């Protein structure tokens, strides 16, 4: 589909997203990021993410995010302008949480190819950072 069709798909509804990163397979074992995101047609977006951390032997970081977005050649391009930890604490130190947040912020700006999984579900695939699932009700 065309870039303007893709833009209309993104702006016509609000979206939820899920991204899972497996860390170990045999200390932090896995990270689940669950988000709500709104793409506005003026090129702004707002995104609120719950970063769920699972270490073997559960803790959560809440992040509010704003920035600019664009569609080019069926890729979703994102340039975050600000992040704010609004989490209202854990079994992880403040340094650990800061490092996890830095990786989250890096993922937040990755360009992702857009593919339609079904009427309510999109797959966002990057070259080197995996896939995020975008879905609506």
Curated annotation (Swiss-Prot):
Entry keywords, A to Z: Cell membrane, Membrane, Transmembrane, Transmembrane helix
Periplasmic side: 3-137
Protein name in UniProt: Transmembrane regulatory protein ToxS
Its membrane topology: Single-pass membrane protein
First-listed, main subcellular location of the protein, grouped into a coarse class: membrane
UniProt key word Cell membrane: yes
InterPro entries, per database record: ToxS
Assembly and binders: Interacts with the C-terminal periplasmic domain of ToxR, possibly by binding and stabilizing spontaneously forming ToxR dimers.
Pfam families: ToxS
Locations listed in the record: Cell membrane
Gene Ontology CC, one term: plasma membrane
Function: Interacts with ToxR and stimulates its activity.
